[PDB]
Amino acid sequence: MQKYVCNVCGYEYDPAEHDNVPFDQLPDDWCCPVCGVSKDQFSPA
Ligand SMILES: [Fe+3]
Numbered sequence: 001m002q003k004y005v006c007n008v009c010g011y012e013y014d015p016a017e018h019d020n021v022p023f024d025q026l027p028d029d030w031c032c033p034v035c036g037v038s039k040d041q042f043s044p045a
Contacts, residue, residue, distance in 0.1 A: 005045035009035035012045065 001015040004023045011034040015022050023042070031038055 003045050004039075004042040006032045006035060006037060007041045007043055008032070008037050011035065013042065 001020065001022055003015070004013045005011070006013075009032060011032050013023055013026075023039070026039065032041070
């Protein structure tokens with residue numbers, strides 16, 4: 001499943017590590033757990 005990386009801090013969201021919850025299901029108020037930016041500052045990776 002499509003992984004995304006934080007442009008600012010390099011954190012990588014891998015659905016497989018979160019019970020197969022895809023990036024597109026995360027809430028509008030979700031932010032990077034390392035640096036706090038919103039989903040719009042992530043890139044497919
Ligand atoms: Fe980040």
